[model samples]
Target: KVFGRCELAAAMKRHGLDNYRGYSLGNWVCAAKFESNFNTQATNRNTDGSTDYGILQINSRWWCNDGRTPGSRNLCNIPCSALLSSDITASVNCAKKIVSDGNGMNAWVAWRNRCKGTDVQAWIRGCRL
Candidate 1:
């Protein structure tokens, strides 16, 4: 399912991502936009044969298992399917863990390449939160 802007904003506030890893919520929102456009079931195979999972586009190479595929680090410890759930709590938890693992938002290339130093206020402009 694709999440609306306010839905994402509400999720961010609920996950306390407004100041997550010392970065602004805008970074996360913008990253998510470029990553999966808020689709809970979005998945993309990377050039390296790893798969990116869910709204965050977390890679199986480091964070999840695609079941049939082997050699995933599975750092999140949850199945890749968990990241694709309509309920984003697992994805949010894993994302926080990824950030806490010293990756910051840099774990997401979308953030580094597109959101870094960019004014992202428009990302949440219509959200009541």
Candidate 2:
């Protein structure tokens, strides 16, 4: 477990994520909740056989690669394991690249599937930015 809601917000703020690009920190934290439940080491295999890595649940098919997975685009040029560390640096960097791609949080299935249009303001509730 890397963080809870309050702690995650503080870490993101400390890492300069308070106003990442044009997206709100609420969306970032909300996405983290749905994606990894704040556990940095989270991993899940999709039905298509691709594995998602870390807090952002970045997919191996398009982003990072673990030797066990085949046909990795590795757009982030990072190993899948690099995202699983307790440190959020690499994971956050990769997530920035994804949001900058124009899809924003929509790039994450969970955002579109769960967080979109929802009341995300409560995501940072009780956290001081």
Candidate 3:
């Protein structure tokens, strides 16, 4: 599923991303934009053979078990396929676990490079949160 900007904002908000760990909903939205462009099924394979999955692009190396990553921790305890679902519940939960792990939003390189310290409010402008 491809979500519009506001649609992604609303969904992330509903899943408790609003101001999660000092990052605003707009920050999350902005991260999603750069990570997957709001595409639920987005996936990227890293040079190290790890894969990133879903809207938030949770990685297989440390978060989900893809049965392929060299040393996956499966810290999220979920199949990487779960992150590809349009439902987004599993993705959201895994994202929360990721932030709670002390990485904060910086866990995502996209977030760190594009959304961090920028005017992320632009990502949520005109949305009814």
Candidate 4:
């Protein structure tokens, strides 16, 4: 298959976080890895037409309660799988800035401090796009 957690985690480290880039990459990367194995195109069913995808499990579609609008430039992942197009890396770069604010460390800290110990429902439920 595509790159695994170990590989993706390294990518996260390389991208690092904005302000918290010092010591939280591991936690953030691990959180995403545990949640979706770094698959970008992965999707979770809502049984209600809600869209959920990407490493952070965010729903990129606007009608899904967190969907992105035109010109919004709202960056996002594609569930656990990689991107549908060849621009997966570029998509991730957009997502990093839009979602993580380029702060994987802060994201990690947020997960650890807010939802790391919680269940998948709790973790996903609490987070937004």
Candidate 5:
């Protein structure tokens, strides 16, 4: 599913991402925008042989196990396929785990380059919640 900006914000808020670990809904929304353009099934392979999966593009190297990523830790304890679902529950939960691991939202390069220090409030302009 390719979610609208507001829809993605609402979904993230519903899943407790708003103000999670001091990051606002705008941060999550902005990261998702740059990471996958709000597409739930987005996937990208890294030069290191790990793949990023789902809306937030959780990586196979450190998060989910794709079996193809050498030495994957699978810290999220989920199959990489789980991140591609439109349901987004597994994706959201895995994202939370990533942030809570002391990495903050910087776990995603997209977040660091695109969202960090930017006026992300515009990303949630009319989301209203």
Candidate 6:
């Protein structure tokens, strides 16, 4: 990803997150815009009509509440957007719990693979990181 304006990849790079795979912060924003409109607090249902939530459409019961009873977990206690970190930090680190996976862009790759079924480049000009 290009390190011009976007902050996430920049933070990753600053913290040596190079050597990973995925799109730049711009592409991430683009994908998020497409997926959940950048709404970290977003929620949706599965094809079967089950519920999911957050920026990545993560399942709330499974991810947020440690798989507690449906709706039993209070989402207000864990603010997803506030855990966004540096406005660009890739991982969703909230009190040592990773709401979002920061497994070296594998999560990003898996997201695209499972969601879009396309190959993604981190940058348009050339490969970086």
Clashes of each: 0, 0, 0, 18, 0, 1
Better of 4 and 5 by TM-score: 5
The residue ranges of model 5 lying beyond 4 angstroms of the native Cα positions read none
Pick by TM-score: 4 or 6, better one? 4
In order, the Cα lDDT scores of the candidates are 0.86, 0.85, 0.92, 0.45, 0.92, 0.40
- Lowest summed lDDT window (length 10), candidate 3: 99-108
C-alpha positional error of residue 74 in candidate 2 after TM-score superposition, expressed in Å: 1.2
| Whole-model alpha-carbon lDDT for candidate 6 | 0.40
Off by over 4 Å in 2: none
TM-score for all predictions? Answer: 0.93, 0.91, 0.96, 0.47, 0.96, 0.40
Per-candidate alpha-carbon RMSD to the true structure? 1.2, 1.4, 0.8, 9.1, 0.8, 6.9
Better of 1 and 5 by lDDT: 5
Residue lDDT tens for model 2, 5-70: 988888877777677877678888989999999999999998888999998899988888787666
Candidate 3 error regions (>4 Å): none
Instruction: Evaluate model 4: give its TM-score.
Output: 0.47
Error of 6 at 96 (Å): 11
lDDT of 4 by residue, 1-120 (tens): 244545555554455431233334444555566545666555575555554555654544421234333332233433323433323454345445444455443443335665444452
Tens digits of lDDT, candidate 1, 1-129:
899877897897788888888877778889889999989899998777888889999888888777755666888898999999988888988899998987688888888999989998878887888
Q: Return whichever of 2 and 6 wins on lDDT.
A: 2
Q: Report the C-alpha lDDT of model 5 over 19-73, residue by residue, as the tens digit.
A: 9999999999999999999998999999999999999999999999899998878
Question: What's the distance in Å from true for residue 67, model 5?
Answer: 1.3
